[model samples]
Target: SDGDTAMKAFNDTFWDPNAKMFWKDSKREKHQDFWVEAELWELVMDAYQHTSDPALKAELKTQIDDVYDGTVAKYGQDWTNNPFNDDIMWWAMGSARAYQITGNPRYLEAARDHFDFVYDTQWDEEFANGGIWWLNSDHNTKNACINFPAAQAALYLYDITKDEHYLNAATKIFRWGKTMLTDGNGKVFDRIEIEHGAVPDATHYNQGTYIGSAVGLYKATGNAVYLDDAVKAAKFTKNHLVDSNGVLNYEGPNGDLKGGKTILMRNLAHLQKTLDETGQYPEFSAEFDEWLAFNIEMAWSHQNSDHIVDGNWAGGTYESWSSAAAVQALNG
Candidate 1:
């Protein structure tokens, strides 16, 4: 029941019910901003789906509502004012996923509305073979951040609505993105510059999101190509992103990168489920299953005296962001 313990520790100690946000530490002095809030929304959605405990599931449900309203209060109901397209995409992805779990019409409404707005605004057909603009102000770059999460967002809406348009949108993003944002060896490049070309460097969340979007496409279209690509991306993350002890390398103790592994863990587990259902990549899935289990175990083992976890799974200081990341993994 460490899942329960981790979730309880994070929520009881770090979550701010009034703000619908997380405190940076147990002091509750500083609250998280938009991006981390959206990520936590997505985390709670996953935790809700993963939890067998009805009370925990209900707690997550309340969080889904709280965070959505909380976000709306801080950033307008129309999220166009936010500069980063990827920021909007993360919240939309969480909204879309939450709808799938709760069957709440408002959540789906927010998901569909937010996605359509971001898609309409970010869509670039003439800009390097079609990919989303990374930001409203920056038209020169298209990033893995927006593309893959938008792909999953589209697929989430597709799952609920059975809309061909959503699937088409997802396919367009995935295919165009696969070519432009990868290192040709399944490593997800963070960005592609019109002036400079693909800047190929790997990051955990990008790798995970790429795998997630690929697996989703495979499920939707029954295309083995996407499945193959998903496997390739997952291999890159597990093989390339880890330290000597087979734990994920330290990203950072603060900032956005620290929480990234949360999304990676979520999607790796997502891909693993698909593998289980399709019986497609048992070898890889089993291996990752073993590896992920060890990683999560080590992360949990590093809990602070207050039963809180830190960003470094290998052991370090605790922060709400990394703790949320660990909680997401424990939920996995």
Candidate 2:
């Protein structure tokens, strides 16, 4: 019911019928742009899966088709020159999930191809004690945003294809993240500079993919340690990132703030499912669900007439990042 209300508000505010895609904000001034657009579409796909609404499903298909074609036209079919490894990885993550939803071979093919390209070109063992770079041009910095999602993407491919290579790569990336990026309290840092050192900034999404990576590895190998890592990180996030009222919050209007928390919520949902199936962490699952519901309610309460949400989840401006992310958290 609450989720349904949130979705209706989001679609009413953000969907652009003329473009057959979502707008960047409530203003409807521009088409969805930048790498966050991929995450936005992925959230739409998640919503479609949850509701099984034919119209929403059709809209998801149209958006994906257009994005794939447009990306290829602008960056070439192979996306060889795409400078941002995280950008390409985000699309690959969405494509992989789309393939799972639609059973479409083309989506799988595109995801696999893009992932392989990034893995081969951008992952540097010699740089920053081993992790993927944020940008292909800059090998000096390794970010949790890039590497954790890459690991999750690899694990997704492994789940679908039963490929050991994907499993190995996922584990490698996960291990590196744990070794280098994670702090003493199990909070994952934002990034590490090879020459400088670790940036102790912890963002919601970074915590998310770290948990997702662990969950992925736990499923792939049936390893309890991975699940343990996930539970620890998830708890750390809840304690540190959320307000006293259990509403999620973060630093400023940075592009990734809203999207990051939304991504975190998505993974927490995934982690909850995993725990439910395994009967492993019922307490954590219950707490996560409660926290998620609170944040969703907070977002819904703050939604403006145009359905735009605040990056802090407090309610306000209709920036693309917050709106799309809020919708995903609600649906998730």
Candidate 3:
């Protein structure tokens, strides 16, 4: 049932019908074209694995071709496109996964080409001292939020190519995040102003990035420091971000009202990742079920059943960050 609900939502919204392209959203948002199209390749491929529908397979091919044939070129490398930013990293990563599932070298080649572009362009001296710029051109101050995708891409590339450069880049990116964004107590903060470069109060999404980054480091180096870092970050999140009923919240003042649902799905995702890496997958599963129930309740509380838009879960009325949070959680 759990997998079914997740799979259904992914298919209904991400799988487009008329134009035969995965549009990335039920409603159009700028930069939405790039990442959604990339992510859909993975989502639909997964659907194909389970259902074995030829039509779905054909649709998946259309998505792959659409991006390769310049549907993606329409956006032209603008990072401000919300979905295009570091999400191109995910496109390559997901494309690799798609290849693994389907044994298609074309998908693999597409992903590799994109990764090559990302590594060549995004890696610059300005962001994170060795990390990626938040945008392609370096307009907004770089933050852990943007750099996390770099870590993901690096590791995924290493997984596929066994390139030491990929692992080396991943290690440095992870370490930079730790030094700048996470405190000794494992409380990972939100964006650091690039000008001032200070960690903001711990945000849910920041917490999410730390889990993956720390785990990636641990995996790369087998260093207990990274594992320990993951454990501390996880414990800190549960202590700070979760509510009385195990409902995950975004951020808190260590005071009354708790945090907001602004990043509920993302918060829950970090919580789940933290637990899984710590050998607590069963506990993680239970916690996620509780959190999902809470999300459903919250959606009902607002009487917003029609709000379930693609990339936006528990209703689409929340902020863009909120929907992004939900997308991460849904992927989890």
The candidate that wins on TM-score is 1
What lDDT does each candidate get?
A: 0.85, 0.78, 0.54
The C-alpha stretches of model 3 lying farther than 4 A from their native spots are 21-33, 36-87, 124-128, 199-201, 242-246, 250-332
Evaluate residue 144 in candidate 2 and report its C-alpha lDDT on the 0 to 100 scale: 90
Model 3 is weakest, by summed lDDT over 10 consecutive residues, at 254-263
Q: Write the per-residue lDDT of candidate 2 for residues 54-104, one digit (tens) a residue.
A: 775576566556655555554555654678888889888888987887787
Model 3, residue 136: distance off in Å is 2.8
* Model 2 local distance difference test score: 0.78
Q: Per model, state how many residue pairs clash.
A: 0, 0, 0
Can you write out model 3's per-residue Cα lDDT over 77-189, one digit (the tens) per residue? Answer: 43234434466665666667666665678767756777667667666566556655556655545566556656766776677779898898778777777777667778876
**What is candidate 3's local distance difference test score?**
0.54
RMSD of 2: 2.3
Model 3 clashing residue pairs (backbone): none
* Candidate 3 C-alpha error for residue 129, in Å: 3.6
